[PDB]
Amino acid sequence: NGNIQVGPTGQLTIQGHPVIGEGGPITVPEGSEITIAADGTISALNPGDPPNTVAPVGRLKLVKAEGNEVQRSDDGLFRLTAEAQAERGAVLAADPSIRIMSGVLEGSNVKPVEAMTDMIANARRFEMQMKVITSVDENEGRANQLLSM
């Protein structure tokens, strides 16, 4: 989620519980007018100063990790898998080759096609299970006549 926000006091907060980059939480001057570069540097121009004062105010740390070496952590946030921890360590490096696309957000990768057949197959499998259950109980009930008499 790249939907970054600024508080009144200048805390860069992807939806709160703020963002971490090159140090602690990134802080910017209150009259931010933030711009974010391709490699992660963050520059700030106070609105009433000459535009040749856009000196960079921070850097946004980015990390490379995918799939096998990342797991969800009961929030929308991912962490390392503790199998990728006797590896690239507890806190990863900045990997200065991951790029930023500014002014553009990313949506969810929820494939509707595979979800629709996920649901179709789920329903069919469920009612097959119900047929097996029905036959099994009818077997047992009709069987119970052995022991009587």
Partner: protein, 260 residues
């Protein structure tokens, strides 16, 4: 709606202002002392999107940031105070101006206006009045039994009586020069009034301290070059064509957006 439609609308309004100025200039041919107008335009906001600075990396700079912009707001109409051509009206009470300067006139409310006209008359009482009775300053009362009215190049107006072979000096007609002619605010009537853009008026005798001279029997015509106005009319109509074509394009884009 669309960012494009507002922009095109401002373009249409700017071209209509241009055509308004052309029509007003073009209709006031054959109006004495009228001064040409020209509209100065001015572009509106530029919505910054990517700052022209705001480096795109640690070392890079991101030249020529992305900003879109709108509008063609008209900022001014400067009025050209250049000398107009003279015309020989043969009338003894008409005077044209040789260079800078304005005739002062007393408005009926008591305030002073200024005209570059010569069409003077005489009312009931001999006072010099200007085609509408607005009495000029300072007062010049022609005697009843006069025959000739002569207004020398220095502005000294003197008349000749019956038999009395002495052209008695009956008054003085002095000019009013403004440090900024273009700042005058026009009230119609071929009259401009002082505003705190023009500056304080300098009244002085003609010829001296930059005021112009006085040509009796001539009237200063409008300085409107009709050829330039015609070619401007062509250009303005074509610009209107183009902007309305832009409106059509945005409308059709929106229409197929709607059919979606």
């Amino acid at each position: 709606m669309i960012s494009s439609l507002w922009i095109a609308k401002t373009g249409l309004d700017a071209q209509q202002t241009n055509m308004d100025v052309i029509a007003n200039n073009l209709a006031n041919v054959s109006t004495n002392g009228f001064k040409r107008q020209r509209a100065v335009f001015e572009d509106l906001l530029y919505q910054t999107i990517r700052q022209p600075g705001a480096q795109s990396s640690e070392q890079t700079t991101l030249p020529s940031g992305l900003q879109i912009g709108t509008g063609v707001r008209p900022v001014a109409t400067e009025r050209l105070h250049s000398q107009g051509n003279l015309s020989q009206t043969n009338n003894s009470k008409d005077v044209a101006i040789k260079g800078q300067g304005f005739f002062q006139v007393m408005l009926p409310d008591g305030t002073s206006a200024y005209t570059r006209d010569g069409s003077f008359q005489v009312d009931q009482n001999g006072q010099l009045v200007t085609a509408g009775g607005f009495q000029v300053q300072p007062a010049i009362t022609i005697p009843a039994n006069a025959l000739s009215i002569t207004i020398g190049r220095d502005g000294v107006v003197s008349v000749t009586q019956q038999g009395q072979a002495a052209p008695v000096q009956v008054g003085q007609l002095n000019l009013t020069t403004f440090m900024n002619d273009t700042g005058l605010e026009s009230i119609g009537e071929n009259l401009y009034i002082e505003t705190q853009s023009s500056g304080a008026p300098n009244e002085s005798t003609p010829g001296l301290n930059g005021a112009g001279l006085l040509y009796q029997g001539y009237v200063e015509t409008s300085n409107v070059n009709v050829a330039e106005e015609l070619v401007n009319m062509i250009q303005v109509q074509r610009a209107y064509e183009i902007n309305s074509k832009a409106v059509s394009t945005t409308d059709q884009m929106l229409q197929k957006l709607t059919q979606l």
